[PDB]
Amino acid sequence: PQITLWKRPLVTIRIGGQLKEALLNTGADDTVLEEMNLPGKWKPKMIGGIGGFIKVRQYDQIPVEICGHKAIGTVLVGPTPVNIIGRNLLTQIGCTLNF
Amino acid sequence: PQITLWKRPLVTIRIGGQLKEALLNTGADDTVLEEMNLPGKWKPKMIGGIGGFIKVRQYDQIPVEICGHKAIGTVLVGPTPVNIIGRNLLTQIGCTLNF
C-alpha cells in the first residue's frame, strides 16, 4: 500500500484476537500498545518521548498482523495516548519512506 | 530517495544558514526543533507526546530544505529530545509510507 500523510497514518492491527487501530510511527524505535493483558513473562522498562518517560511492560515474540502482513516481535504495553507501531515491526513488513 | 527503517530515519536539513540533523517522523503532526533562535514573531504553544506536554515557540512560514527538497511552513522550537520533521512538512516534499 502507499499511505499519504495528510492525516495521521492509522491502520488496523490484529493481536491476540483483538483488532485495534494503530499509528505507523517512523519516529518510534519500539511498538507501544495501550493497556492490554498479554500472556507470558515480561520485564519493566522505561521509554522516553517528547514530554518525558513512562514505565511499560515488555513482551517478546508476540505475533502481530498489520494490514494483512504478518510480523513477530517485541511489544511494549503501557499508558500511551495512542497505539504505536514502531520500526521494529515496520521493518518486518518491508515498510519504507519515499520522496 | 527511498529510506528503510532498520535505523532511525535521520536526514540533514538546512534552516537559516544552519545545518542540523532531524528525524522523518510520521508519528508527529508538527515539526519540532531543539532550542535555537529564528527570525520573526513567535507565539507560545503547547504540544504533547508520551510523557506529557511541553511548551514550545511557534514560528510560521519558515523555509526548510529537507534532504534537498524545499518546504515553507510552521516550525516549533523547544525542549524536544530529538529534532523531528513532522507531517506538516513531510506532505510538502511529497513523502509517503510504502510496503
Binding site: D30, M46, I47, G49, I50, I84 | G27, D29, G48, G49
Partner: peptide, 9 residues
C-alpha cells in the same frame, strides 16, 4: 534508551 516520538498539538 529508546525513543517513541509521537506528537500532537
Amino acid at each position: 534508551k529508546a525513543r517513541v516520538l509521537a506528537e500532537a498539538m
